[PDB]
């Protein structure tokens, strides 16, 4: 939904999306080759599926080519200063890729506005959408936009023949929050099932070694183990085929 969206959001209204109760296979998109860069910050590109965060945040905005390099932890640059201010301890992976084949259009794509000028940089992840026309000089503008008075936003107009420094690179940056139980985790493999062999099993929670034989014990619809009169494991419900 977020990556393959048809309607991306402009950068002056840069987006955010809390995602919970998810199984997030980061690698099925890491091995996509449709990206310009998977520049993880805080963690590695792989070795995410073994992580369990509370929520992840999917920003969905588009920038130019060099503004990708602008996007990085604790940077100094127009977008990192007036549109999307990463904190320096940002835990995630910026995932940007050109869309000059997709979002560009003849004559230009004038639907994108970047925060042209404003008095000061933002807080981390501060979503500034206020369109208060720039105040400067010595007087408020009152809409006329006189000298030193300007609009805080500037249209892009993506021309399909613009260089890599001006081509649309739809960017989507993810963040990791840990507070509470973790509802988002990468998937877990599940091997084949071997019976009648002393194996070192590991069912979803519990471990141990034994010889798994097809039984006839009839658990209740919700149970997961069994136990013996001395509280030793005696049966396990196969979590793929019950």
């Amino acid at each position: 939904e977020v990556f393959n969206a048809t309607r991306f959001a402009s950068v002056y209204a840069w987006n955010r999306k809390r995602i919970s109760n998810c199984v997030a296979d980061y690698s099925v998109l890491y091995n996509s080759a449709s990206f310009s860069t998977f520049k993880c910050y805080g963690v590695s590109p792989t070795k995410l599926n073994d992580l369990c965060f509370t929520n992840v945040y999917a920003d969905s905005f588009v920038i130019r080519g060099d503004e990708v390099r602008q996007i990085a932890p604790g940077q100094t640059g127009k977008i990192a200063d007036y549109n999307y201010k990463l904190p320096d301890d940002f835990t995630g992976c910026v995932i940007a890729w050109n869309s000059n084949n997709l979002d560009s259009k003849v004559g230009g794509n004038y639907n994108y506005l970047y925060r042209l000028f404003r008095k000061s940089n933002l807080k981390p992840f501060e979503r500034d959408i206020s369109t208060e026309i720039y105040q400067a000089g010595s007087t408020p503008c009152n809409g006329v936009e006189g000298f030193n008075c300007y609009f805080p936003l500037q249209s892009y107009g993506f021309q399909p023949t613009n260089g890599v420094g001006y081509q649309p690179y739809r960017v989507v940056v993810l963040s990791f929050e840990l507070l509470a139980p973790a509802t988002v985790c990468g998937p877990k493999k599940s091997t084949n099932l071997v019976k009648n062999k002393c194996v070192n099993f590991n069912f979803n929670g519990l471990t141990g070694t034994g010889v798994l034989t097809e039984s006839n014990k009839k658990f209740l619809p919700f149970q997961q183990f069994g136990r013996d009169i001395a509280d030793t494991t005696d049966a396990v419900r196969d979590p793929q085929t019950l």
Partner: antibody
Amino acid sequence: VQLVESGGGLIQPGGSLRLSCAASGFTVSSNYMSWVRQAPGKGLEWVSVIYSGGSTYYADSVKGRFTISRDNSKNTLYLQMNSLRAEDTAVYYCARGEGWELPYDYWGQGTLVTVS
Amino acid sequence: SALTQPPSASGSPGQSVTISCTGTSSDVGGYKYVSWYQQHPGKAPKLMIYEVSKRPSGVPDRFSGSKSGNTASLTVSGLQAEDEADYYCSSYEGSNNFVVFGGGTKLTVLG
């Protein structure tokens, strides 16, 4: 837009000049500004910028040594330098503007600065 | 890399003269914005044509040359006795906010 620079001179390696461009006509706070210089008989040489969020940039020969600053209000505007060599003689001029977008249209009066 | 040009381009008074502005496609064929410059000897660096389809507020009309892909060119029409000066160029690099300029086009109008 009455901007009047002040502070040029001639400096041996080690000194530091602090220019002072008055910002009477145009706020430098909650605004932007750029510093430039021109070698006699040459196109311009961008030497410094100051964004609204205090961001700063310098060109090759001046990054790491050139240090621009200014007071909180629209009083003044500086350009400090360090480790001067014989290569840096060029007439100075102030350039109202910031980067390519929002071009340089308004300018200063020009202070003759010579480094050798 | 820099907007290097032939520093001397001449022509007859009243007719037109082309003042070029040449750099690499990393910038000149990338952005929407290129700005032109000119200086009468001693005058402050005066921009000529920013946002090539645009000019400043009251600056006269016989300016506004264009950008022919990888190479720009200023087309001054109606050369009058006040059209003798030095010309320059200006635009932005593709790195670290770097703003570029021209090598210095001394517009030598025949006297």
